[PDB]
């Protein structure tokens, strides 16, 4: 590597020394990709080595095996696991690919060419060559669209994906007739992010999921071809900054938005994150608790539509602000929760009284009781329950872990976007190192501020 | 040539000649904020009682309904609404819009937009003045704290009623109930936040005492030392070498800041990163990650429970928990 | 305490963001000389900004 | 206490405020 005097960047900003070095940039990137696939494979092997079959995966502290099981590998009806060999194969393949990527990144970092422009014109680039940056972006867009279409092919012809909305408690379903209608697909995008709408977190069926994936894959492929065969327009060239730190800041803002959004999926969505693998959500656990105590007091010979609470609002069933029949108590705030075990009990006017009385199911009751016992309430010592609870239960929801970690990473990366966008603007401007001391802009304009 | 209306408006907006810089971030910062201040003053003065818990038990919160300044607070939104969006047009009448806590959502949304665009405007003026732009990066920590206590915690708990009430006694109620729920005192992120504000006070006193102690004698004892400093001067006003030597023989020689740039960077970075950590602690508690749980940890050879200070903290948490929202719980487990 | 923490953070950020060039190097921390009688951050620019 | 506190608040908001105004105007009228 280089030093402080030859580059002007200190060791704690050493990667800035490889801003203009394309070969070392590529080496750092490939070594980092090797690190990411290494974590994927190593965590997969660790989780399958620490996997217990007679327990649900949300009690065992796993986050990658639920991801693989959602795609429908080694799982059967009801969310039960049938084989861990697909997870083991995925982990081993990721470890080998990580070895390959790490070798490539290390080779380019150490003895790879320093600059690719004078010897490899296809891979050479300067940060102001907007055409070449759009070509690289187009290639990556083709790769992303191919990956989305690969997921689509997996859910269509390659065993399908796990449907938690299947009758009986969910099963590995083959997707038939994906909803490719632009209106319903993009109504998620132009939706409000508040309660009752939830923006794209409230996607409730694999048909819309696969339709949106088909749409995003086709859009990404056409956008990649467009970027390969076009150049940024003059309005975009006037509006944007064309430095490497600027491009990094744009990517940082984007991935911060994705981190916050994925935190919201992990906390609220139970379709792309099935509850049989990730545990119940907050609303799901509260509604499961209310429904379990509902059926308990119904078995104990107590009227459920009547028999109001101490506030006269309803102990078991009452009215939502819109007017639907919802579960009583503080779980009113979770009246928009939709799960596989409430929908058969829900009619046109919300929770039907006759359906809740006679159309009950033992599997629904068992799932609700298990979700009530396993709410996403825990300490960072992995102590189940609220903060007052005794150190006796070793469980914290994977949904809670994913949401906390991803919101943290999204916020740090938003601040990183702030830092890099400001430094990119100041570096393109010319005063990123300070004030010129002979051309102070404040003294060039009049007093009184 | 700057004659067209949009060019003139753009030059006026980006003008650094104004008393307060507006900018393209200010064109959102100003109207959203003035909306928030207007409705906040009006609600704090004459807001009718708000049914916060959703149990048809309203809370006054406003001065004209019998509140003083400490007890006066804009009450959060009704629990029946939860995370639903409740603007005035989504209500049939202003009476029920005020009864259900709509002003709280309007103030919170406008305040979040206002602080975000205030941070953007801080960057914009740093850009238009030829300055380094990380003042907004420093200001990202109180913005993170406000977002965590006004939006992120209501998102994690599923109800805007769960946010921090816009007041003082409401703030204390939020903190007490929050301790009951999550045991925030036993959390590392909150511990780093407390260490950050304590160290921020310590370092503010340290830096101010070192600089004010080392000012160059340019006046007499019958006139204020501030009169020795002339604005716009280039000559230094204090002895950096004397201050650094005093600090070095006070605490440690090789562990002292001999460079003012590194010293001021440390002063900037310490409370900012600690407030980042505590805001993220609140946001992780929003998804119920909670603090350290050491209830019944020390056990003797016969298995009897040996209580500790964490068990006394558990007793405090129980005392808060059995009393918070005393009529809003029809069931034992507090999962909402 | 909250005002003191605010003052510490805002003073550090203001000083570090209103610095003079003194550069020929991207790291400003090596752009400082202890034995000098000149200010390294623009008080005028800081006052105008705030 | 409903009006004795009012009198105390009034005296507190005027007497040092008036004193500060005396000193401020005594300085402002001198150049």
């Amino acid at each position: 590597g280089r030093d402080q005097e030859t580059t002007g960047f200190a060791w704690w900003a050493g990667n800035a020394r490889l801003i203009n070095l394309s070969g070392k940039l590529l080496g750092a990137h490939v070594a980092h990709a090797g690190l990411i696939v290494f974590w994927a494979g190593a965590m997969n092997l660790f989780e399958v080595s620490h996997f217990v079959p007679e327990k649900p995966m949300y009690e065992q502290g796993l986050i990658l095996l639920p991801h693989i099981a959602t795609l429908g590998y080694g799982v059967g009806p009801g969310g039960e696991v049938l084989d861990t060999f697909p997870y083991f194969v995925s982990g081993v393949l990721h470890l080998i690919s990580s070895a390959v990527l790490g070798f490539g990144g290390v080779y380019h970092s150490l003895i790879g060419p320093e600059t690719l422009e004078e010897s490899y014109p296809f891979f050479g680039y300067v940060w102001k060559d907007k055409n070449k940056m759009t070509n690289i972006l187009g290639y990556h867009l083709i790769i992303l669209g191919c990956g989305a279409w690969l997921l689509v092919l997996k859910a269509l012809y390659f065993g399908g994906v796990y449907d938690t909305w299947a009758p009986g408690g969910g099963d590995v379903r083959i997707i038939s007739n994906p909803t490719t209608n632009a209106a319903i697909i993009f109504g998620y995008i132009v939706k409000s992010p508040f309660g009752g709408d939830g923006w794209i977190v409230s996607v409730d069926n694999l048909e819309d999921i696969i339709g949106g994936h088909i749409w995003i894959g086709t859009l990404c492929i056409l956008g990649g071809i467009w970027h390969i065969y076009t150049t940024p327009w003059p309005w975009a060239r006037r509006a944007f900054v064309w430095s490497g730190e600027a491009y990094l800041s744009y990517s940082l803002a984007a991935v911060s938005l994705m981190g916050f959004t994925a935190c919201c999926f992990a906390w609220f969505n139970n379709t792309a994150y099935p509850s049989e693998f990730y545990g119940p959500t907050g609303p799901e656990a509260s509604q499961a608790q209310a429904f379990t105590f509902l059926v308990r007091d119904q078995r104990l010979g107590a009227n459920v539509a009547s028999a109001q609470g101490p506030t006269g609002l309803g102990k078991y069933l009452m009215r939502s602000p819109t007017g639907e029949i919802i579960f009583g108590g503080e779980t009113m705030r979770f009246w928009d929760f939709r799960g596989p075990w409430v929908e058969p009990l829900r009619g046109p006017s919300g929770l039907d009284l006759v359906k809740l009385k006679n159309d009950i199911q033992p599997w629904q009751e068992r799932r609700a009781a298990e979700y009530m016992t396993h709410a996403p309430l825990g300490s960072l010592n992995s102590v189940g329950g609220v903060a007052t609870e005794i150190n006796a239960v070793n469980f914290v929801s994977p949904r809670s872990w994913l949401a906390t970690s991803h919101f943290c990473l999204g916020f740090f990366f938003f601040v990183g976007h702030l830092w890099h966008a400001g430094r990119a603007r100041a570096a393109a401007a010319g005063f990123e190192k300070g004030i010129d001391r002979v051309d102070e802009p404040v003294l060039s304009m009049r007093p009184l501020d | 040539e700057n004659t067209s209306l949009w060019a003139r408006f753009c030059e006026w907006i980006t003008s650094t000649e104004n008393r307060l810089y507006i900018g393209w971030f200010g064109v959102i910062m100003i109207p959203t904020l003035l909306t928030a201040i207007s409705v906040y003053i009006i609600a704090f003065i004459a807001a009718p009682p708000v049914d916060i818990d959703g149990i048809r038990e309203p809370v006054s919160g406003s001065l004209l309904y019998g509140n003083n300044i400490i007890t006066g607070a804009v009450v959060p939104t009704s629990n029946a609404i939860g995370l639903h969006f409740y603007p005035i047009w989504e209500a049939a009448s202003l009476d029920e819009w005020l009864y259900n806590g709509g002003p709280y959502q309007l103030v919170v949304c406008h305040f979040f937009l206002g602080v975000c665009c205030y941070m953007g405007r801080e960057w914009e003026l740093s850009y238009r003045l030829g300055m380094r732009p990380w003042i907004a990066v420093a200001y990202s920590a109180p913005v993170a704290a406000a977002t965590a206590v006004f939006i992120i915690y209501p998102i994690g708990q599923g109800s805007f009623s769960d946010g921090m009430p816009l007041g003082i006694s409401g703030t204390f109620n939020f903190m007490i109930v929050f301790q009951a729920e999550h045991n925030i005192l036993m959390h590392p992120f909150h511990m780093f936040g407390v260490a950050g504000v304590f160290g921020g006070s310590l370092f503010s006193a340290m830096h101010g005492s070192l600089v004010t102690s080392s000012l160059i004698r340019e006046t007499t004892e019958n006139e204020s030392a501030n009169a020795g400093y002339k604005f716009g001067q280039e000559e230094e006003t204090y002895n950096i070498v004397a201050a650094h030597g005093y600090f070095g023989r006070l605490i440690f020689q090789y562990a002292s800041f001999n460079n003012s740039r590194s010293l001021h960077f440390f002063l900037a970075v310490w409370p900012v990163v600690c407030i980042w950590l505590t805001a993220l602690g609140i946001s992780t508690m929003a998804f119920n990650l909670n603090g350290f749980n050491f209830n019944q940890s020390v056990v003797d050879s016969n298995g009897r429970v040996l209580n500790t200070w964490a068990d006394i903290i558990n007793r405090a948490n129980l005392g808060m928990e059995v009393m918070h929202e005393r009529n809003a719980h029809n069931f034992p487990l507090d999962l909402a | 305490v909250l005002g003191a923490a605010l003052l510490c953070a805002i003073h550090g950020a203001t000083v570090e963001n209103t610095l003079f060039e003194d550069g020929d190097g991207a790291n400003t921390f090596r752009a400082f000389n202890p034995t000098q009688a000149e200010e390294t951050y623009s008080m005028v620019t800081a006052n105008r900004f705030w | 206490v409903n009006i004795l506190g009012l009198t105390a608040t009034a005296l507190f908001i005027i007497i040092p405020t008036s004193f500060l105004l005396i000193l401020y105007v005594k300085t402002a009228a001198s150049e």
Partner: peptide, 30 residues
């Protein structure tokens, strides 16, 4: 009768903020 005292104290406080912001002593830069 207490509410009017509170509102008067706060509007006086906002008046002092507006006064300090907009009618401050200009820096002399001399």
């Amino acid at each position: 009768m207490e509410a009017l005292v509170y509102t008067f104290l706060l509007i006086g406080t906002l008046g002092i903020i507006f006064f300090s912001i907009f009618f401050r002593e200009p820096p002399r830069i001399a």
